[PDB]
Amino acid sequence: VSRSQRAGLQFPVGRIHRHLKSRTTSHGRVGATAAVYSAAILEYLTAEVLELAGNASKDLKVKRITPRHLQLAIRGDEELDSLIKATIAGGGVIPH
């Protein structure tokens, strides 16, 4: 039984544990539930972003998400705009 099923998530708890161990605590150790919490946070943020992008795509009447929809979703929310400040290749600009 993979730890994701025990946590009821979709992201890999084991792989995220390995990735956290690589960066470690500067030669220390990583707890058991650190991976679970990290995977939960990643899943929640990805779900939020993808929901907004899907709403933007549906408003444009298309059946597939594109970087333009991703930027439309990200720049349409205050908090997602605060958290994400990177340049998205192929997204254009928000009309103003």
Binding site: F11, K58, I65
Partner: peptide, 23 residues
């Protein structure tokens, strides 16, 4: 995993390769 989350949120929406790279 991103695809699984996407199909959990929007069951009737796909994603392109470039958007996968962004994600």
């Amino acid at each position: 995993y991103v695809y699984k989350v996407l199909k959990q949120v929007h069951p009737d929406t796909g994603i392109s390769s470039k958007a996968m790279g962004i994600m």
